[PDB]
Design a protein around this ligand. Structure first.
Ligand SMILES: [Br-]
Length: 330
């Protein structure tokens, strides 16, 4: 089997991407944030504290003939940005782009933090990291991808995120029309439960490539590119007026600037992030100070190849027995 679903930016800054997902019988379609940095499929629901729902579409398990309470199971998750959610668990039929999994754990939110409430466009998350990170207790549950894997034509999914445009998540096949040149594959460590890999270095603009190992995670659920302070300093040093602002929470730069591209290495291959992708616009409405899309990972504990990086590539998440990651230009 295979599946193919369009993913769409939630706003004009590509802050996140939503993908329609069918849950239950008859189908309830919710727009979920596919997150290769976590491993819970959770949704706003008929159980979510009413004051914490503001425009989201909710899953109502009592209206699904295939929903079953997973007795005794609860979940609770905290994300890198400090947001969180928790609740109880149903199993139900879940379909993405024509690919159907029966008995998928669908984690129903009883509580969500303010950042989720305030984002009316995101009805929940669909985790695509390794199932070892799943938070369901006392019996950990499998991700949609892990459940689907045995049925897939090939044990892979691909992320093709757009810059200010729709893109695609495919399951079970590699669309050879969706990228240019070749796909370069690189080793993955699952020791931390993430799609963790090592970039071979970077360049700033038309500068020379610096060969250096940068361990990080491929994370579709993170907006920006978070890299070591040395790398980030080298980038912003090429932008007149750029500075790190503790009051704003990162690098800012004059909105009048032209930003250089940023290149990252994948083996001997190179992925180029255009400068435009790195401009996240005014720090506040009407400001002439703009927020950078490359930020230091120093306060995080891990480097993160978020959407800023991933949307410059066609990315293969290979979930074979020995997992790997593939990157191609597009
Ligand atoms: Br390769």
């Amino acid at each position: 089997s295979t599946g193919s679903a369009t993913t769409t930016p939630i706003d004009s800054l590509d802050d996140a991407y939503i993908t329609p997902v069918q849950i239950g019988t008859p189908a309830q379609t919710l727009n979920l944030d596919f997150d290769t940095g976590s491993s819970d499929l959770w949704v706003f629901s008929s159980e979510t504290t009413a004051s914490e729902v503001d425009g989201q579409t909710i899953y109502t398990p009592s209206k699904s003939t295939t929903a079953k309470l997973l007795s005794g199971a609860t979940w609770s998750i905290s994300y890198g940005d400090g947001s969180s959610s928790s609740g109880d668990v149903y199993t139900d039929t879940v379909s993405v782009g024509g690919l159907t999994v029966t008995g998928q754990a669908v984690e129903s939110a009883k509580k969500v933090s303010s950042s989720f409430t305030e984002d009316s466009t995101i009805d929940g998350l669909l985790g695509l990291a390794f199932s070892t990170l799943n938070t369901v207790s006392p019996t950990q549950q499998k991700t949609f991808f892990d459940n689907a894997k045995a049925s897939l034509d090939s044990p892979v999914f691909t992320a093709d995120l757009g810059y200010h445009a729709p893109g695609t998540y495919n399951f079970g096949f590699i669309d050879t029309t969706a990228y240019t040149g070749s796909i370069t594959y690189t080793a993955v460590s699952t020791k931390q439960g993430f799609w963790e890999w090592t970039s071979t270095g970077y360049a700033v603009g038309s500068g020379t490539f610096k060969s250096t190992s940068i361990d990080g995670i491929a994370d579709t659920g993170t907006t920006l590119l978070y890299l070591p302070a040395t790398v980030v300093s080298a980038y912003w040093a090429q932008v007149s007026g750029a500075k790190s602002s503790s009051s704003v929470g990162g690098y800012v730069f004059p909105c009048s600037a032209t930003l250089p591209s940023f290149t990252f290495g994948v083996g001997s291959a190179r992925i180029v992030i255009p400068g435009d992708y790195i401009d996240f616009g005014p720090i506040s409405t009407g400001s002439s100070s703009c927020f950078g899309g490359i930020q230091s990972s120093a306060g995080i504990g891990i480097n993160i190849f978020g959407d800023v990086a991933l949307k410059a590539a066609f990315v293969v998440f290979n979930g074979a027995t020995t997992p790997t990651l593939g990157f191609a230009s597009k």
